[PDB]
């Protein structure tokens, strides 16, 4: 059985503005001090990115559409965000990739899963010993047929019901092209929680998987913190920590990437944002002299 979350407050999703974030290495080749130009799926600069927040008894695990691509960035302190579900039908009728990170081995498997209406992870604080354990793992029901499974090494993290300011910024990019699931990741320490900071942070590829299934919807997994001072029921005592993750969608875009001496991408420029940006794309330079130029037709 799977317990169903109840008595959760629902709020409209807020909107915020991205600031030139989401540039990743598009190939395995190494280049230094070269103003290379590439054409691929990118998150356009200054885009309208939806912002979700979890915090009386406010909770949110909406089934957001996958679209062509997703830029998932979550700023967190207590690692309340654990994993993501990637499925089309999400009712054990079609393969549904399940990526979940827990105290046990990181589980990255694709199987037919009868996911319940509310797939929320649950971590309970025990009174016999002062330790946090994942007493609830009722996210799905059964897995009849498993085409492919990959179980990684176990990972241990400190899970606590803390409402303090987020300590780290984690950025992930998901793409499904040619039957390969590509994940790019970055980890940057941060203290300000007002909004995403400025600057360029290149995302290095993490892992590639040949899942070979087409995905139209995805859902984020949020842990529930239940201490010894809370009943621990889904009705009451399930108050989770402060959570904030941002979801953006990739589009076909042309970027001009700048490589420094060590091969890192310091800066980038869009080729469709502004006439000045288009001119800089045409001249293949970050500085434009006085004059008049022909960009396009």
């Amino acid at each position: 059985q799977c317990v169903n979350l109840t008595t959760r407050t629902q709020l409209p999703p807020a909107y915020t503005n991205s600031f030139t974030r989401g540039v990743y290495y598009p190939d395995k080749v190494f280049r230094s001090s070269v103003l290379h130009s590439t054409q691929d799926l990118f998150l356009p600069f200054f885009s309208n990115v939806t912002w979700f927040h979890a915090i009386t008894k406010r909770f949110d695990n909406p089934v957001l559409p996958f679209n062509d691509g997703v830029y998932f960035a979550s700023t967190e302190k207590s690692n309340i965000i654990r994993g993501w579900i990637f499925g089309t039908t999400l009712d054990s009728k079609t393969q549904s990739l399940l990526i979940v990170n827990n105290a046990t081995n990181v589980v990255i498997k694709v199987c037919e899963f009868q996911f319940c209406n509310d797939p929320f992870l649950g971590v309970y604080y025990h009174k016999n010993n002062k330790s946090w354990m994942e007493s609830e793992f009722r996210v799905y029901s059964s897995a009849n047929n498993c085409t492919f499974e990959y179980v990684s090494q176990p990972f241990l993290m400190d899970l606590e019901g803390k409402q303090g300011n987020f300590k780290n910024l984690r950025e992930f990019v998901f793409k499904n092209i040619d039957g390969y699931f590509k994940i790019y990741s970055k980890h940057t320490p941060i203290n300000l929680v007002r909004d995403l900071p400025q600057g360029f942070s290149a995302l290095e590829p993490l892992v590639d998987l040949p899942i070979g299934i087409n995905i139209t919807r995805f859902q984020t997994l949020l842990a529930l913190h239940r201490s010894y001072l809370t009943p621990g029921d889904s009705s009451s005592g399930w108050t989770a920590g402060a959570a904030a993750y941002y979801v953006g969608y990739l589009q076909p875009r042309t970027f001009l990437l700048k490589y420094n001496e060590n091969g890192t991408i310091t800066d980038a420029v869009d080729c469709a944002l502004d006439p000045l940006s288009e001119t800089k794309c045409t001249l293949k330079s970050f500085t434009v002299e006085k004059g008049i130029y022909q960009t396009s037709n």
């Binding site: 290495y25 080749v29 190494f30």
Partner: protein, 297 residues
Amino acid sequence: FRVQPTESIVRFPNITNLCPFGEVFNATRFASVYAWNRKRISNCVADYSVLYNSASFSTFKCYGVSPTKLNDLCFTNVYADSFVIRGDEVRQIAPGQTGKIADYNYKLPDDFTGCVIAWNSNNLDSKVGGNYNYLFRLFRKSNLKPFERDISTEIYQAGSTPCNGVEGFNCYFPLQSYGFQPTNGVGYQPYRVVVLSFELLHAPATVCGPKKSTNLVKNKCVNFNFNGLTGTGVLTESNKKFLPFQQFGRDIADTTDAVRDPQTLEILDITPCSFGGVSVITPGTNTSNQVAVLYQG
């Protein structure tokens, strides 16, 4: 002027696994054309000696690559596609060819790079009363895109009369039984056809030829072969830093100037051997026959 290479070196990965050709070719249960099966092969040395031997192989056609050279270069993600078609249809499974089976079933892209292997089956896939397990589609609203599959089972719509469940006039099921019999002619016998698709798709390479790897020699104009990359230049130790996922290097001209050794994971630079030019000066044939030689670079 030119400098000639002295030695030749090969640096292939050390892989002991052997790809299971047995399942691909010698399979008791062999899939139908309506739902063709795809098999992924990786991380194994592939010996293609058996293939050009042509033992009981009716048709061995390779597009974009030569079978004799197949055991030299190095690939990634070998695909195997298995399906069963009638004896007079094997011709139409080829690049750039349109037919009843090709348009309504498994079809090949015009840019196909692989070998098509076909051998005749007499009675292994035939029944005295007619084998009806194998099915083919003779109706389809829109021609299939390359490498597509159809799992729908609906009555095809002809005319204004509704179909796909409303059986009636001008309502025909696209799927038909092939009806193979051993008493039929050679042109009506079932044939087992397997399609191999080859792609590099990235710097890393998984399936590589059984060629032995030799030692490494440096600071000499030699012929080097790194994972199927052929060139001629001196090899020296490189101070350039590669990020762990990166494997190659490129300059402004986009020619390779660095590469990582597969066996030892060491960064080494590549520099072309000096050529220059030759200019001969003469005081004049009348005065003397002595000359001086100037080498440009």
